[PDB]
Design a protein around this nucleic acid. Structure first.
Ligand SMILES: [Mg+2]
Ligand SMILES: [Mg+2]
Ligand SMILES: [Mg+2]
Length: 248
DNA sequence: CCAAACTGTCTCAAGTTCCGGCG
DNA sequence: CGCCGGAACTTGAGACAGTTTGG
């Protein structure tokens, strides 16, 4: 990892779960912030802080990395006019990011506003009564739909769907999905495990369809992905599938 | 019977801005 | 004026479920 990749990734995370703020305070004071918010403090300390510290050192930025606790999430914050303008201008050079720098950038956007999903959908039309569904998605407020459109243009596959105030970029085609995640995975931090579990499920999907036991095993891996995600409204699990197969 | 698209929803985890203090 | 520490304040998310299409 170098500044080229670290900086691209961070910009992605900043855009996704943070922001760049130029503030004006009373008493003729001011502040410039580079921020990344995240519910988990450990995740920030283990993956983000080290990378930001590295970039800060290489850029000779003297400000300190602050980790502030908020009501609903933790916040990694660097109060630096220099770092602020560095990222704000890079914002305009994204369109020129080459292969690997673009992947680091994307990984940043994914660890922030992305979701790597595995689902078991009940459908009586399938032999084992369920469809094994895999999804890569990026959600963005509808005003930034142009961004999702750009993703379709850059990645090459997938599409965009609007659902009110927000929209999503979606990729579910197994082959392209496997290829895309094989490329993005090394750059991910927060969602690297779910990325690799999705890769494993795809590689075992055909075998999963040839036997009830192998199908349940693979459903086990989807349970694991859901556990790694902020799973709150999940209904069909591997055990639900087992009960159906047993009654058959 | 399956891959992939289409359509809808649940419950937050993000994002944004104001305050007093420092050098 | 710009660098700390905090936290109130206001949203964009994530992560599923359910249903239908077309080879
Ligand atoms: Mg976001
Ligand atoms: Mg986000
Ligand atoms: Mg996030």
């Amino acid at each position: 990892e170098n500044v080229s990749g670290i900086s691209a990734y961070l910009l992605g995370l900043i855009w996704g779960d943070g922001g760049l703020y130029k503030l004006k305070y009373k008493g003729n004071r001011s502040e410039y912030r580079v921020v990344i918010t995240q519910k988990s403090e450990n995740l920030i300390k283990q993956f983000i802080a080290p990378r930001m510290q590295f970039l800060i050192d290489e850029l000779n930025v003297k400000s300190k990395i602050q980790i502030v606790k908020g009501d609903t999430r933790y916040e990694l914050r660097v109060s630096s006019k220099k770092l602020y303008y560095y990222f704000a201008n890079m914002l305009e050079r994204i369109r020129l990011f080459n292969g690997n720098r673009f992947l680091a950038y994307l990984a940043g956007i994914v660890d922030g506003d992305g979701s790597i999903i595995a689902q078991i959908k009940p459908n009586q039309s399938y032999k084992f009564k369920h469809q094994l569904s895999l999804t890569f998605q990026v959600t963005q407020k509808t005003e930034r739909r142009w961004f999702l459109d750009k993703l379709v243009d850059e990645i090459g596959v997938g599409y965009v769907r609007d659902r009110g105030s927000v929209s999503d970029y979606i990729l579910s085609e197994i082959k392209p999905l496997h290829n895309f995640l094989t490329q993005l995975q090394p750059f991910l931090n927060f969602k690297q495990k779910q990325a690799n579990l999705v890769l494993k499920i795809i590689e075992q999907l055909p075998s999963a369809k040839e036997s009830p036991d192998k199908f349940l095993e693979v459903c086990t891996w989807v349970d694991q992905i859901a556990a790694l995600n902020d799973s709150k409204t999940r209904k069909t699990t591997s055990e639900t599938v087992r009960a159906v197969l047993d009654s058959l």
